[PDB]
Every structure is written in structure tokens, then in C-alpha cells.
Amino acid sequence: SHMASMIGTTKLRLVEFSAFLEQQRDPDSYNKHLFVHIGHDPLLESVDIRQIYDKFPEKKGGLKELFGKGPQNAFFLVKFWADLNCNIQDDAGAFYGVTSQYESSENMTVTCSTKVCSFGKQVVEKVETEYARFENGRFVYRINRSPMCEYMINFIHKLKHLPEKYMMNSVLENFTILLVVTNRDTQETLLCMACVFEVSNSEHGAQHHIYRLVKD
């Protein structure tokens, strides 16, 4: 491992990320469960990116190609321990969503690509285009309550039916998420988060660990 300071370059920083299930009990009463969360310039250890290439798509526009183009300090591995300890009612009051916030000193238009991958193959891509808001002397890029795709909702349901967390972890060995934030107009990679998953051993907590991706 190589430990050094630089989720975020000096051009874009991830400030907040949270994936959640919000359940309406009645028009004035809601419960929200967090599956994972970030944010609720440190030294980061490193991971050799070559050991994750087979967990993500790898041809035109794939992870290896993106990393080669750089900047390499925009690339991170995120290990999540997800909290699956919640009810999953099957009714209209259930909303599965993701909220994220990025910040920059520069006013840009950014594209956020989220690729859901199974056995290293893309099964869903979500693409969101975001313009900046000036706030507190910087530019903020917020995605509020972006709906989860059907594949992900069904996948959470499937994991929850397993009787032991170690069985969920075995299934998750082949599940990854690739988040790439790009300057829409210049096509510069601003942030790339390669995400891997286990289930948290806490009863009501989620955890994460961030690593820099390095070429060897």
C-alpha cells in the first residue's frame, strides 16, 4: 500500500453520498433507512488497480481505458459495508433513492454515470446531467432523491431473503458499482469511484473505506 493525501481531486470533491429507503407511514410520517453513507484531505492508502479490472467492463470506455487517460488522482476504490437491517414493504409508500453532493471551485456542467455491474458486466447505467449552484463561495452539484433502478431494488430484496450475512457477502462478490463524474463539455474525468460491497456486521450501522487507485 502507498499512503498519501490527494473522495475528490482538487477539481471535484464528493461531499455527501447516501443510498436510502424512505417509507411513508401516512402523509405526515416517514421513516428513512440508510443502506450506505459517506459524509454523514486525509491520508488514503492505495490499491493496485490491476486487481479490480476483471470486476468492471474493460473495453472501449472501460475502467482500464479511463484510468489510462487520467488524471490518476481522480480514481478511488470504495469498500462498503451496507446496512440491510430494515423493512422492505411492497407498497406505494416505499421510495428507494440516492442523494449525492459534489463541490468544486469551478463552474462546470457535470455528467454523473452510475454503472451497475454483475460478474464485471454492465447491467444498468444511470446518466444524470447536473448544473452548478453557487453556495458559500463554491460551486455545488447536488442530486437529490435520485430513484434507484429496478435491478437494484430487486437485488436488495433478494439479498435480504438470505438467512446469513456471509451468504449475502458471497453473492456480493460478483456485484460492483462504477461511479464516474465527468465534465460534460471537456470530457475530463473528475471523479471515478469503483465500489465493492459486503454487508455490515453491525446491527444498525453502515461503514466504508476509501482507497486511492494506483497503476501498479
Side-chain angles (χ1 to χ4, degrees), residues 1-5 8-105 107-135 137-216:
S1 170
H2 310 265
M3 209 173 173
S5 60
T9 66
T10 319
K11 269 208 195 53
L12 187 77
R13 177 172 44 102
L14 172 75
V15 154
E16 192 275 339
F17 186 93
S18 68
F20 62 88
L21 167 51
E22 179 174 81
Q23 176 62 57
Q24 193 181 301
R25 183 244 289 179
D26 62 69
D28 296 340
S29 305
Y30 294 80
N31 172 265
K32 184 195 263 186
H33 170 84
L34 306 183
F35 296 112
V36 299
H37 51 85
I38 299 171
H40 290 48
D41 198 39
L43 294 184
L44 298 173
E45 303 195 44
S46 65
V47 167
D48 185 332
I49 193 173
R50 294 171 301 174
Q51 69 191 103
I52 67 172
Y53 278 156
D54 70 348
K55 300 178 66 60
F56 297 95
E58 292 304 347
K59 272 141 190 177
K60 186 193 177 87
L63 177 61
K64 180 183 186 165
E65 171 177 315
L66 276 179
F67 182 82
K69 175 160 55 65
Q72 291 177 349
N73 75 343
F75 286 75
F76 301 83
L77 171 77
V78 184
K79 300 186 56 175
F80 286 107
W81 287 261
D83 182 345
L84 296 188
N85 185 10
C86 67
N87 304 323
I88 48 169
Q89 317 172 21
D90 201 336
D91 73 78
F95 179 72
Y96 293 77
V98 181
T99 295
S100 54
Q101 180 168 306
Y102 306 90
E103 291 178 4
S104 177
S105 62
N107 191 345
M108 307 176 277
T109 304
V110 308
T111 303
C112 296
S113 162
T114 308
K115 285 168 176 174
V116 179
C117 302
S118 180
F119 297 87
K121 307 297 190 47
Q122 174 183 317
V123 295
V124 186
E125 184 187 18
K126 183 195 275 188
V127 178
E128 301 166 290
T129 303
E130 305 296 326
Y131 295 94
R133 194 197 297 281
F134 182 75
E135 291 186 17
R138 71 201 37 114
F139 295 97
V140 178
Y141 305 84
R142 189 174 174 89
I143 298 181
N144 202 62
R145 301 173 61 90
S146 180
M148 290 195 189
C149 65
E150 301 171 342
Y151 184 97
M152 284 300 309
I153 298 173
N154 174 251
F155 185 59
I156 291 165
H157 294 182
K158 282 205 232 265
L159 288 176
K160 286 221 55 165
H161 283 289
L162 301 169
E164 294 279 13
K165 290 181 178 177
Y166 62 81
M167 298 168 184
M168 305 172 192
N169 289 340
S170 301
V171 172
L172 287 163
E173 298 180 7
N174 297 304
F175 169 79
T176 58
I177 300 295
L178 185 65
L179 171 64
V180 176
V181 185
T182 303
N183 183 317
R184 190 266 295 280
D185 298 317
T186 70
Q187 286 303 294
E188 178 181 352
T189 300
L190 301 172
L191 177 63
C192 173
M193 285 166 50
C195 303
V196 296
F197 296 83
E198 297 191 342
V199 178
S200 174
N201 282 331
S202 316
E203 306 317 303
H204 293 287
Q207 299 128 287
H208 71 277
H209 205 107
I210 304 168
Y211 304 83
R212 305 177 310 114
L213 286 169
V214 293
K215 66 189 215 308
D216 53 36

